[PDB]
């Protein structure tokens, strides 16, 4: 019989990519937003060019919602053995009950572990969707402030 190697998300090295907070009320939340404000610097350039005043701006960002779901079944005659409605006051049925409990336990440990690899995959899925190719970024940050 084979074992199942568990993986803990925060044990991996990928966890430094995203800050994660538990939030047991997320299902209640409608469109949620986060804000931003930044102040650019300025240099007092001498000459006929109109000396520009310090600029201010106000930027926000909108949340996006996803989900994760995994499903596992259970056998119909196994239900009569877990519950006891089909249990007999005998010496065999205890063995079948032990076997069915073991099966349900292995199965639920399998599925309850799947949500770790799930997040470890979701992180790569989102991190791959924003990152522009380096070929089109290395020279772009070299022509800053001139695209007018």
């Amino acid at each position: 019989c084979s074992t199942l190697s568990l993986v803990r998300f925060l044990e991996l090295g990928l966890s430094v990519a995203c800050v994660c907070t538990k939030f047991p009320e997320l299902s209640y939340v409608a469109e949620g937003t986060i804000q931003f404000e930044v102040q650019q610097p300025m240099i007092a350039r001498d000459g006929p060019h109109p000396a520009d005043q310090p600029v201010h701006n106000y930027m926000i960002k909108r949340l996006d919602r996803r989900s994760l779901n995994a499903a596992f079944s259970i056998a119909v005659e196994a239900l009569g053995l877990i519950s006891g409605e089909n249990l007999d006051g005998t010496h065999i049925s205890s063995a079948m009950r032990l076997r069915a409990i073991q099966q349900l336990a292995r199965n639920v440990q399998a599925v309850l572990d799947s949500f770790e690899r799930g997040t470890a995959d979701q992180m790569l899925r989102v991190l791959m969707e924003k990152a522009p190719p380096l070929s089109l970024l290395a020279p772009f940050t070299l022509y800053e402030g001139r695209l007018a």
Binding site: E129, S135, L136
Partner: protein, 49 residues
């Protein structure tokens, strides 16, 4: 995608937007034995400069 400007009709908020659009586009082609128009349901990521 060379004679259709309806995509070019979509204005560019800035060169950075068109940059980000590359490297994350959706695949228009299928994954079958031939190159067929793809059912828009599934989709996948593909880069094209």
């Amino acid at each position: 995608k060379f004679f259709t400007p309806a995509e070019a009709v979509a204005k560019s908020r800035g060169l950075a937007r068109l940059i980000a659009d590359t490297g994350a586009a959706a695949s228009p082609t299928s994954n079958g034995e031939y190159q067929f128009k793809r059912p828009v349901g599934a989709g996948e990521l593909v880069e094209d400069p």
